[PDB]
Structures are given as C-alpha cells and as structure tokens.
Ligand binder design. Structure first.
Ligand code: ZN
Ligand code: ZN
Lengths: 138, 137
C-alpha cells in the first residue's frame, strides 16, 4: 500500500471509487475509462454522477453513455498535466513523481482560492445591496 | 515530504538521527559518512554509539574515528541490497523503489525472527540452569 494522499495516482484506486456508477458494459465512459482519464466518483444528493479529476480538480456531471472521458477532460480542463503523463506509475522516477505531486498541490490550492473568491464576491454583492437598500429607503 | 515509514530512505533524514554523535570533523565516520552508508543512530544507555542499517538492520557499536562505515557495513552484512544501490533516491523508479521497500520488509521480519531465536535460546539456558540447580540438591 501507499499513503492515502497518494492513492488517487493509481488507476485501480480510482476505479474502486466508482462503485454505484451507472454506465457499465456497452458504454464508452465505463469506470475503467473514467479512471484512465483521471476521474474519481464524488456523487452528491444533487448530482449523483459527479466526477472529479484527481490531479486538476475539474468537476463534471451530466454524463451520457457515448461520452469519451478523455475528450471531455480535454474539453473542460485542457491545462491538466496528468493528460500529458504517458508513463505508468511504476515507471515514474521519484523525482518525476514528486514533481507531479507538487503540481497537484498547486492545482488544489488554485481551486480552493478561486472558490473563496467566488464566495467572497457573492457576499460582497449581498452586503452592497443591503447598503443600497438602506440608502434607497431615503 | 513523505510517509514516516519511508523517510529513512533519505540521507538527510538519516543524518538528522545522529544527534549526540561524538565522531565529527576530522573523522572517517562522520554522521554524513554514516548516513551515506545506510546507518541510523539508535543509542542506548549501555551501547550509546549503536548504529543500525535502515535497510538490512545490522547493528554496529564500538566505532573508532578511522572506521570507514561502508567498509564496516560490508564486513558485518555483506548481503545488504542497499550497498548495491548506485542511483540517488530521486533517480529511482517507483517500481524500483517499491521493490526495495519489499526487501526491507523481509529483512525486518528476518531480524525480528532471529531476535526471538536469541531470546528463546536465553530463556532455555535459564531454565536448564534452574533444573540443574534443583536436581543437584
Ligand atoms: Zn485533470
Ligand atoms: Zn545494510
């Protein structure tokens, strides 16, 4: 085994996350193919087919059977290093592997940051409106 | 950073273990040289210069300044894969690295087994002496 933080680098681990996935034999986006593309299954009450790239953290829902997960990952996050990684896990050098984990860490932060921004912007609008409402009354 | 179980594969970690080491500048077995050879410092009250290969688990004490730790590791555990490892950590493949960790796991068990033997042999002596003492008088 490997530390939990690193398991997602492994196809077999990612495939294991797709339990309860509806798109199985006959479909283009099987868990094998989803896993090959970098995805983890992260289902919610609201979107129960929600998947996340483990590396760049793009989230995608609304899957259909004919969908090729690589072509979609490419469409919705063309900046994802993992799509450039040609070698298998065991064929990576530790330097290479450590370089990738750093990038993934940067990606994660980027996603957290951009979230906080969107949330902060949302609160700003609320607060601004509220104070306009207070001017408006007189 | 890396899981604690794996840190010992890193020289700088091993060097860090040598705190209170007496053989410093001028000596053949400086912590840098000891680390380079695979050793971790795990001193006891009784044997306070005790060092252990992280990989094959050979223990060596009674160090003197002119001692070259590679030549000693070679003398007391010539079977230790780590001494064959020419590449630096980052230059290893994960397969390679995982192959090595497996071997280290085997090594560990082998040593735990050989300890239990030594202990079992020790108890046997005590019990033998005990029965002799009793049967005699
Ligand atoms: Zn991605
Ligand atoms: Zn050794």
């Amino acid at each position: 085994t490997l530390p939990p933080a690193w398991q997602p680098f492994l196809k077999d681990h990612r495939i294991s996350t797709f339990k309860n996935w509806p798109f199985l034999e006959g479909c283009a986006c099987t868990p094998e193919r989803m896993a090959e593309a970098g995805f983890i299954h992260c289902p919610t009450e609201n979107e129960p087919d929600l998947a996340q790239c483990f590396f760049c953290f793009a989230e995608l829902e609304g899957w259909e059977p004919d969908d090729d997960p690589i072509e979609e990952h490419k469409k919705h996050s063309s900046g994802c290093a993992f799509l450039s990684v040609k070698k298998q896990f065991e064929e990576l050098t530790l330097g290479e592997f450590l370089k990738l984990d750093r990038e993934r860490a940067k990606n994660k932060i980027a996603k957290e940051t951009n979230n906080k921004k969107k949330e902060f912007e949302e609160t700003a609008k609320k607060v601004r409106r509220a104070i306009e409402q207070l001017a408006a009354m007189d």
